C-alpha cells in the first residue's frame, strides 16, 4: 500500500522533502489573548424615515469595535420581482467620523458595486438574503434586513477600531436614508400609497479585552493601515444609437490606490448597470407580449449578459502616458475579477486593479495618485443600435453594439480604494495623510 510510495524516493525529491522543515501532521496552535465579543445596540439620533438624515454615536461599552450591522424593517409595496436589494438602496450613504475628522464614506451604489465585485458564492447569496426578498414574497410582506457596513474595521478584527485608545474622540456614523426605495415605497416614478416608513437600528459588535491587552491598547500609540473609499459622480458620455460615444475623465483621486472601480447606470433604478431588453430577465415582462423595455425586472435588475453593457473599451492614462494598452469592457468585467478576486462580476460593472490581490487586507501593489497630476480614465462606449424589443436583435448581435435602451444609462460612478494610516495616540486619533 502506502509504503510503496514512501520507498519511491530519490534525488528529485530532495528539493521537496530533504532536510524537512515542516510537517502537516502536527499543528501548533498559537495561544491568544483573552477577549469576548458582544453585540450592542446603538441609539439612533435624529428621525428615521425615508429621505431623512440620522446619526449614531458609538457608545463606549467595549474596548475595540469591528462589525457593524444596520437593521432595517421594510414592507413590500408590490409583489415578488418588484424589489432589488432594497435595504442597500435605502442606506443611501454612511459617513465615518472620528474625532470630528472625516475618515471614510460609503454610498448605496458602492455597496452594490462592492458586492458585484468582491462578494461571492454563498457569501453573496446569504448577503442578498439579508437585504432583499428572495423567496417570492408578496405585497405586504415584512422583513428585517441586515446591512453590514464595509469600513476597514468592519471587515477584519485586525483593524478593529480601538475605541479604548480613543478616549477623547467620538466615533460617529452619519446615515442618509433614501427618499425612495424600489418596490417598497415607490414603483419606478410612482409612489406607493400605504407604504410603511422604515424601522432602523444600528448594531455594533464590541470586543472586550482582558487587562494586559486593554492596557496596551489604551496606552500605546498605534498606526492602523486602513483602507478608504474615494468617490466622485460624473455625467456619462451618454451612449448613442448612431455612434460610439467617448469620454476622458480626470479623476480627482489621491493616496496609494489598490484599485479603481466603476459603473454606468440608470439613476432611476438602483443597481441598473445594463440596458433593458426583451430577453428573459432583462426587462419587466421580458420574453412576452407585456414586456416593456422601459422598466427593469427589478428582482432581476443585475445580469451577466454583457450585450446589454455599454463600455466598449477603456484605458487609464497617467500624466499623458498610457498605464496599459486599451482593453475591452469585457476585460474589466470578466478578466480583472478572474485574476484579482475569483468571483463573478455583473455586466455593466468594471474593475481595474493596481494590486495583485485587491480583495485582501495586505497591500499588494498600489498606484499613488498623490503623485499623479493627470490621472485620466478613458472610456469608449458601444453603439446603441439594437432594437431592444426584439430578442433576436439582442441575442444574435455583435461585440461593438448594444441596446437602444442603453442610452438610459446616463450616470457614471467612479470609485477608488486606497490605503492610509489612522494614527492613534494619547487617547486621540486622525489620519496621517489628507
Amino acid at each position: 500500500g502506502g509504503l510503496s510510495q514512501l520507498v519511491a524516493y530519490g534525488a528529485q525529491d530532495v528539493y521537496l522533502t530533504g532536510n524537512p522543515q515542516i510537517t502537516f501532521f502536527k499543528t501548533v496552535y498559537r495561544r491568544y489573548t483573552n477577549f469576548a465579543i458582544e453585540s450592542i445596540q446603538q441609539t439612533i439620533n435624529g428621525s428615521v424615515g425615508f429621505g431623512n438624515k440620522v446619526s449614531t454615536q458609538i457608545s463606549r461599552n467595549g474596548d475595540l469595535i469591528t462589525d457593524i450591522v444596520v437593521e432595517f424593517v421594510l414592507t413590500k409595496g408590490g409583489n415578488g420581482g418588484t424589489t432589488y436589494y432594497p435595504a442597500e438602496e435605502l442606506l443611501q450613504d454612511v459617513e465615518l467620523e472620528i474625532g470630528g475628522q472625516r475618515i471614510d464614506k460609503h454610498y448605496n451604489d458602492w455597496f452594490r458595486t462592492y458586492d458585484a465585485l468582491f462578494r461571492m458564492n454563498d457569501d453573496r447569496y446569504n448577503y442578498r438574503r439579508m437585504t432583499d426578498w428572495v423567496n417570492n414574497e408578496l405585497v405586504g410582506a415584512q422583513k428585517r434586513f441586515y446591512v453590514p457596513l464595509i469600513f476597514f474595521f468592519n471587515q477584519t478584527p485586525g483593524l478593529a477600531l480601538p475605541l479604548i485608545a480613543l478616549q477623547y474622540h467620538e466615533v460617529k456614523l452619519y446615515f442618509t436614508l433614501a427618499s425612495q426605495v424600489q418596490g417598497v415605497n415607490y414603483n419606478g416614478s410612482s409612489a406607493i400609497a400605504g407604504a410603511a416608513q422604515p424601522t432602523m437600528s444600528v448594531w455594533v459588535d464590541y470586543i472586550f479585552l482582558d487587562t494586559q491587552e486593554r492596557t496596551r491598547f489604551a496606552q500605546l500609540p498605534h498606526e492602523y493601515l486602513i483602507e478608504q473609499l474615494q468617490f466622485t459622480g460624473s455625467e456619462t458620455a451618454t451612449p448613442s444609437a448612431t455612434t460610439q460615444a467617448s469620454q476622458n475623465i480626470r479623476l480627482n483621486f489621491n493616496h496609494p490606490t489598490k484599485y479603481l472601480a466603476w459603473n454606468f447606470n440608470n439613476p432611476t433604478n438602483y443597481g441598473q448597470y445594463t440596458a433593458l431588453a426583451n430577453i428573459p430577465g432583462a426587462c419587466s415582462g421580458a420574453g412576452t407580449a407585456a414586456a416593456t423595455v422601459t422598466t427593469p425586472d427589478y428582482g432581476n435588475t443585475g445580469t451577466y449578459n454583457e450585450q446589454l453593457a455599454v463600455l466598449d473599451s477603456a484605458k487609464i492614462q497617467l500624466n499623458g502616458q498610457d498605464r496599459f494598452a486599451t482593453r475591452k469592457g469585457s476585460y474589466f468585467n470578466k478578466v480583472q475579477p478572474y485574476q484579482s478576486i475569483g468571483g463573478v462580476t455583473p455586466a455593466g460593472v468594471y474593475l481595474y486593479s493596481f494590486a495583485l490581490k485587491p480583495a485582501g487586507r495586505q497591500p499588494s501593489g498600489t498606484c499613488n495618485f498623490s503623485r499623479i497630476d493627470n490621472a485620466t480614465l478613458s472610456l469608449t462606449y458601444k453603439t446603441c443600435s439594437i432594437d431592444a424589443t426584439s430578442p433576436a436583435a439582442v441575442l444574435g448581435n455583435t461585440e461593438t453594439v448594444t441596446a437602444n435602451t442603453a442610452t438610459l444609462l446616463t450616470a457614471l460612478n467612479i470609485y477608488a480604494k486606497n490605503y492610509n494610516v489612522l494614527r492613534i495616540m494619547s487617547g486621540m486619533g486622525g489620519l496621517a495623510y489628507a
Binding site: 509504503l3 514512501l6 520507498v7 519511491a8 530519490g10
Partner: protein
Amino acid sequence: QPRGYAGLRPYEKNYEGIAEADVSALQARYLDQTRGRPRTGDGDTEPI
C-alpha cells in the same frame, strides 16, 4: 549483461507496522475534577 540495474522497483529493509498491544492497556483517567456544585460546594454543616 547489457542493462545495468536501473534502480527501479525498489524495497525497504525491515519495515515493521505500527505496534499493536494485545494486552489492551487501561484507559487513562482525567486530570480535571468533576464540576459539582458551583456555589454550595463541600456541604453546609447546619447548627443546632
